[model samples]
Each structure stands twice: as C-alpha cells, then as structure tokens.
Target: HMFEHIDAYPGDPILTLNENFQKDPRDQKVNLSIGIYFDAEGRIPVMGAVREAETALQRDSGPKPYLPMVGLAAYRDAVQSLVFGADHPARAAGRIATLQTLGGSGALKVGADFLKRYFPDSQVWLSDPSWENHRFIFERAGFTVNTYPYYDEATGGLKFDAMLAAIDALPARSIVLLHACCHNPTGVDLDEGQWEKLIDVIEARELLPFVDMAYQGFGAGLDADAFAVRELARRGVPTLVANSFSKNFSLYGERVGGLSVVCEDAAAAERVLGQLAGAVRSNYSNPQTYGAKVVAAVLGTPALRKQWEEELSAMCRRIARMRQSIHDGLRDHVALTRYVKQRGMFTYTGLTESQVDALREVHGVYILRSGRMCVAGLNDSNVGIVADAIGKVLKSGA
Candidate 1:
C-alpha cells in the first residue's frame, strides 16, 4: 500500500466515455460518445480482410519471428507504402523516420519524447477542442502546451481567421499539432485553399508540424484523404505523421499503428530513425506482433487489400449518406446546415447543453455531453429514432 499510486482520480477519456451508455438499460439506447466501427445491427463489425489474415496466420502456424527492438519489418514497410504510396518518389527516397508503436497515442507519446529531448524549450500547440487525450499525451511527453482557435461554436464551423492569426503570432519553430483528416469531435475540415495558406504560415514561421491521421478511409477515399500530407511534401516541409490502422482495418483491439517523420534527406532520416528507436526502446521496447502481422497480411495480399478498400469505401459512403440524411431531416432548421459542411465521424450539431441533456435523459441517445454526435453511430435501424429525437428537441427547445 505504501508504493501505490492511486488518488482515486479519473477524467473522461475515450473508453471511459462508455460508462454512461453501458449504464442505460433502455432497449432503444444509441451510442454516440465512444467512436468505433458499428454495423446497422449495432455490433462491432470485424472486417472480413482481418479475419482472412488471422485464418492464414493460424493455418501457416510456425514459430513466430521475434520482432526486433525497432518493430516488425513487414508491418513497418506496409505502413510506409500506405503513407508514401507505391509510386511516390519519396517512397524509395528514405527521407522519413518511421517507427511502429502501440497505436496513434503511442506514436504521439514517442514523438513527444524525441521533441522534448531535442528541443527542451519548445512548446506544443493543438486545436481548441482536440481529441480529449491529446493534451495528456503531449504534456506527458514533457512539454507545456496550449491551444489555437479552431472550432467556432457560434457557427458550428472552424474559426479560420482567428486560427490563422493565432498561428501567426506563435513563436517560430513551435510544434503545431494538426489533424490530417476526419478531425475528431468536430467533423469540419479545411478546404484546400485554407490548407495552402496554413502551409505558407508554417513555412514562413519555421513551425514544426505534427499531423495525426487516424480516421483515413472513414473520411474520404484513402488516396484523396492523403492529399494534405502530400501537399506538405509538395511545399517541401519536413513533418511528423501518426497513422493508425485500427479504424480502417477494424482492428481496434490490436493496437496497430506507425509514426513517420519526413526529414531533409536519407541521411537525416537515418539519424532521426536512431532517435526514434531510442524513444521506442525507452517506452515499451516495441509494438506487439499479432496486430501488426494481421495488418501486414491484409495490406500485402492483393485480394485482402482490395477487400479492405471496398469495405472502407462502404463505410465512408454510408457515413456520407447519413450526413445528408441528417442534413435533410433537419431541413427548415437550417442552423444545422453546418453538418453539411463538415466531413468525418462526429458532427458539431450546434446543439446547446440542454438539448444534449434532453437527448440523453428524455431519449435513450448517449452522446458526448459536448453537443457532438457520432454520425457513424447512426444507421437505418437507429437513424429514425435519432432524427425524431433531434426534431423534437429542436422544436420543443428542450
């Protein structure tokens, strides 16, 4: 009991959001707080591609290759191909520091270590209402952090002007965290022009850009979603990217993900790789084997890769249809037209706290008390229930 570290304190983190939904006993309960891949039947739909890979591994049973201190090579290369693409000139250029990690959070944690070790005085910046865990990761990495003006609750949209001005005022070479696509909490994203302008500010200010790309295929198609990262390459800025397979592959339990840092050139990449290895070595020794192996199998096999793309596209298309349907369902109530502008898992529905309360208590819908709703949580089975709930809330001013 003397060495115990429990103060009996806990904050609402990702999985922690599940408690409320789990407590609700109503048969019609819908979950919008915890983000996950769910089918129309409200079950975690494991991808067929993942299942096939698992079966193959079992069938070919042999002594598992002990993963290196760095990580599983095949898994690392599969991630490399996804990030740089098969034909990208940078694919073979060796100018990126890529490392396998527990998942996106681990990737961010390690990146934080390298930055703190190298740039001890540097501070990190994040969006105002970023993923709840972001501040925890960066601060744990030994950096003081702050937020940039991002979501404008007034319009249920991005506060681009204020965000631009804030970034412009930050000290040069400050670490700025960016979401590559499918910005969490708020589904809103920047247009290409806005991104172009931000890139200009970053290069001119000599800022360090760290991009988190978790929900890739869930937003747009994979390739299309990668445009912002590629544009960083186009603008010739060195950057850090945290990519995860949990969402796209439906392997959430597996904790499979990688981190890549674009460097000045191959030699710089080698140096960065050594430092990245040190971060990994100090953190958890290395990433696990099974999830990485399954991801590798799925990405490497042609048929499985095809199936993955199809399923990912299906998820993306379905989410889009739901966005439109919700947008349509709330037609005359045009303030919600904001959802039409956003693209990603959750919608910043502009609902007040009272309305969110109404949805949770009066109806059996469980969403983040923050007035954000997960579009993926709705399906043909539950959309009607949600649509009606939303309509009633808005009409009743509840």
Candidate 2:
C-alpha cells in the first residue's frame, strides 16, 4: 500500500541496449554497441599480466582476509603511484587519500555521497553529452546537477571559449565533472592549451574538480593518458579522481577501481579518509577483494608491472588501428572524416535512429541509436562489415 503510487520507469539504458543486442540472433550480427574492448579476434582478451597475476594467486593460497574499509594498502598505494606517478606533488607530500572501490561507478557513487554529506551546498556540473549515468548518480546522491557547454557539433570540436566563459560564471565550489582524458560519448578531448586555460579558470573560480578517468590507457600511453588527473593533482587543488580498471586491465567482471582525494596535508587526508571510509561502509561496507588484489600484485611487482604496461600499450594500439582502419575504409565516402579524427573507444557517428535501425536490421551491425559506436568493437574481422554498413547508411541518407 505504501508503494501504490509508484510507477515503473524504463530500466537502465546500457543494460536495456545490451538486452536487445543479446536477443538479436542474426548469424552475421556484428556487435559495435557496448563500450568494452574487443580484440582483433572479437573477444575480451584476458591480458597476460592479468592471467599471470591471477595464476600466481592461485598457486600461493592464503586465507580470505577481509581488506579494511579503505581497502588493501598495497592496492591503494599502487594505484596512487600509477595514477599520479611516484614524483607527484600531492603524493610526495602525503596529501592524498586513496580508497579502493567497486569500480569507477563505485568510486563515483562514494565520492558523490560523501560530497553530498559534507559539501551540501555544492552542485554538480557535467559535460553536455557526458556518460549517461553521471546525472543519475549525482542526483541520486542528493546533488542538483547541471550541464555546461562542451562538445561543439558545428565544428566538431570542443566549445572551449563558451565552456570557459560559463565556468567563469558558475558559483564557487561547484563540482565540475571533467573527463580527465578520453572523453566519453563524443570521444573528443581537450588539448594542453585548453587544459591550461581550464586550470586557470578552475583556480580563479575556486571550483572543485571531480575527474572521471575510466579510460586512461585507452587514449594514449599511461603517462599521457594520466596527464589531466596528474595535472590536477600537481596543481594542489582539491581534486577527486575515480579511476576505473575495467578498460585498463580488461577486468570488467572483477569490479576493481579506486578513488583518491588530494587534500591539503597529511592531517587533512587522515580526516578525509575517515569520512571516505564511512561512505564506503554505508554503500557496500568494503570493496571486493579479488580484483584489487590482482591489480596490486601486478602493479607492485616489477616484472608484472612492466608486462602490464606492455599489454596496456598493445591494447591501446589495437584500438587505434581499428579507428584508423575504419577511417581509411570510409575515406572515399567523405561523410565520415570526423569519425576518423575521434579518439578512444567510442565515436559519435552522427547516425540517426532510423539509420541505426537500418544498420542492425539490414546490415547485421549494431551501434547505439545515439550514434556512438565503440571503435574497439570493430576489429580485423568485423571492421569491413561495419565500414560498408556505415557507408551505405550515409549514401542512402538513412
């Protein structure tokens, strides 16, 4: 009786799309929908580093000890060093508090929840076409959310001036959700000069930075991919980072990730971590064990760490190759040059809903109806199919 007024809304967006994708059983179906990476063989490969670390764990058995609320120290330290680098100012000065979380989503939820509790007056700001779950996550945590001008479709570039102008006008202490690197949806990222301008604005406006870094190794090398987050940390700003392991380590099912806060000093970090742990306690008590342990083992060990770097580089290269392949394949079409220039896993194809439907129904290719195609989903085998389908879709004006 208490719930009689409640009505069911649509289920999760990506899950709903995944449901439809799974249900479609066409023999030649090419899945270019989800954000996960697919190897040249069209499968999620368990990286050698991951396999080796897991295998080592199996060989040396231990009690299933529960990690503390802040999670494995080795894991936390490893991620901190990996993300901000060993020489990072915040880390070197003992101003960072690292917390292991379920995934990037967990880190985000935990951070959002904590911010809502402590920084209640602060509102959230997102990119125009951000990851779909951002608005929902912050709003669920009791923060009013808004969007600033970001991606510019007219020129297919970042609306940097408009964005900076709007950022200049926002109230102080607003939580600006930046992509860190490898922007989602449109796959467009701001370059160094733009980042410098943004940093200037953020400093001048006195706003807080919350960077969502889900695809660090997906865009460029580790040092390069981590440029934004590391820059924010070095700037001595109160920055929050939600770094996901799904794409970096190919550990999607493992649910491993981290959240780090750059505080003013060790005392501040010590106090902040207490609140962070309380937030984690309310959410899930503590993060899962296996994934974080594997990550820590790989990153902490010299051999495994080097191997992982190589594996991550290869994966990024593979995605780049696929992006180039699709780009060159459609070079004659000229309706698709923008896509080739896009970065990271997803590309905004500018395909309409009807055209997306046509791609699936007539061409056995499935892309998100919003036109964001996962470049990782295209590989040596299925790329031709994807290219031809896209070209045909453009030619017919569907």
Candidate 3:
C-alpha cells in the first residue's frame, strides 16, 4: 500500500478508557476518568453568566472575518488583566506579550514551539506526574523533556523539599513547567510559603518558569488561585504563563485560552510577541472567535463579571463538598484525609492498577489507571457508590 509505512497510533489511555466507560451499559456506572467538571446533577455546566454573554453576543452579532494571527484584541487584553492583576506593574509597563490560542493545549504547544526555537539547548523539566499532554507538547516541539520530584504518594502531598533540591541542581536556562493552581491528575499543590521558596530557587538558578493555570477559580477564588503567577511577575522574574477558560467558563468546545510572557522591557516584549505570532501563524492561523469573545464579554462587563465570579465560587464550593464527602465516606476504610487537603478538581486516590481495574470490572466505577480521580465527577448521587467501591477495592486489595 502507498501508506503502508505509516505507524499505527496507540490510543490515548484516558480517552480509550472513556470509550470503554461509555459502552459499559451499567445502571450504576461512575466515570471519574476524564478531567472535565461535572456539576452536582452529573452534567457539564454551562454557567449562567456565560449564557448571558453569548446571548448578548448574539444580539450584537456582526459579520465574521478572520482575526489576526495572535487572536482577538479584546480577549487578549482581558487575558493579560485577568491572569496578571489589572494593576500589575508588568502590564502597566507593557512588558507582557499576550497571545490568544486554541485553548490551554494550544497555548502550551505554541509556547513550546517558541521556547524550542529560542532556548534550543535547554531541556524541559516538568512535575513528575503533570498533565499527561504536557510532556508530549514539549517533546513534539523538539525539546528533551524530563521530570522533577512531585506528588508524594505516601502522604498524598507535594514533595516540595525534594522538588526544590532537584530544581536547584538543574543548570541555568532549563525550562521548568509548573501548575499555577489545581495541579492536574494529583490535586496536591504548593502553598504560598513553598512557592516563595521555589521562586527564590528559580531566580537564583536562572531557570525559566513556564506556568500552566488551567483551573484558575476551581481551586480557590480567581485572585487567590493566581498568587504564584502574580508573585513570579511581581518579583520581576521572566516567566511564561499559559491559562485556560475551559473549566472555568465551561466552554471546552470553544477552545479559549491565552499565553503571556513577562519580559524585562516593553521593547523586548514587542519582539517576543512577533515570534509568538509567527509560531501561531505556522500552527493554527488564529484562535476561534466565539468562546474568546464570550469570555471577554463576561470579564469586561461589570454586571456579568460579578455574576461569573459568583458562579465560579459556587463551583468551588461544590467541589469542596464532594472532597469532604468522599473523605468522610472512605476515612473508615483508609486514611484518605488527603482528599480533604488537596485542592482543585482531582484527587490522587492512591488506588493501584489492579484496584482501578476491579473498580471498573466489578463495580462499574471508572477512574484512571494512574489512580487520579476527577473529584468534579463526584456528586451526591454517586459519591457514596464510588466511595464504597473504592473502599472495597482497598480492603480486598483488588
């Protein structure tokens, strides 16, 4: 055959597992596999504020035309203000170069492409168990990707001390990828003190910090979740930030996100933006219009903005409750107080591969084989069933 030389692609584990879950045909089946947030009603939420913004956009609809390679100007401005506080010095000095991308994935890929070209010799360092696609994004950009210590399994906490030591040993110019808040897979995150110490190390070692803030308001409030990103810039440290509105705005299909670079001077930022635009040009010509415009509308409008914040707070409170419920339910079987301590949409359940298999095969309960459970998938309806299934697996060593 003409295309016989092409290699077969192994399916993504998470997506493949999700496919299997979809066909399970069980009444009490539970799916904690994918990273998407599900509301208490076991449905992906479309926040009321988002609906309002879309409605307004529809009313003021205009002709469709191609946006600039970078993305919508209003959306880009909103990203800069939202991610880095409105009055941030870097933004005030025009030292931030912002680009709207397809989503967090697109931002990461575009940033990776830029880094690969500029820091060609530098290797990429990531948290040991970061989001699955992170390594792929950097590696596909032709950089060697490595991992630093993170995710302490014994206590279901961060291995901060070891992580600091490992990063300190890395040579200057190594690209270090960090989760700004609501660390994926494992929900554990570094506190403010730990982040402060890490910032010192990154500054002292002159390592590049590339932070991914996908779940900004999911862990804490919007401002609270952005503490690390803001602080790194506040200290005048050169940093790259990629943020997403998928989970926060419940607009996953719309693919809305931004990548911002903090530079030493406005002139340098201008030059950097040109390169980023070039990268975006080569990949996807420009970002989508609808989702970003909706996000901008919500964030830019005073009334809608207030409504969005309230809705976000409600989501966080719901996730918090689920965490508490699961922990309370499983506390008797195992010390899973870590569930209560970890922040964001997921929890590292410490379930073994066999346990995960048993949970799926016997109980029709689904979780990633890596033992990462999307806590957002839990609601009042299924939390008990999920907890009991997990408890049985833990007790029986299945």
Q: Which number leads on lDDT?
A: 3
User: Total backbone clashes of model 1?
Assistant: 0
Give the alpha carbon lDDT tens digit for every residue of 1-398 in model 1.
Answer: 88597678677454665776787789998777768767667678888888988999988767766577568888888887787676666557877777788888878888889889988998999998898789988997888999999998888888999999999998877999998888888987888889999999988998999999888887778886877777786566878888888788878878988888888888998898899999888877767888988998999999999998898899888888888887777664427667678887888777788888888889988777788888888888887778777877888874
Which structure among the candidates has the greatest TM-score? 3
Clashes of each: 0, 0, 0
- In candidate 2, residue 80 scores what lDDT? 93
**For residues 173-244, could you state the per-residue lDDT of candidate 2 as single tens digits?**
899999987789888888878888898888888898999999988887888888878887788888899999
Model 2, CA-based lDDT? 0.87
TM-score of each prediction:
0.95, 0.95, 0.97
lDDT for 191 in candidate 2 is 86
**Which portions of model 3 show Cα errors greater than 4 Å?**
none
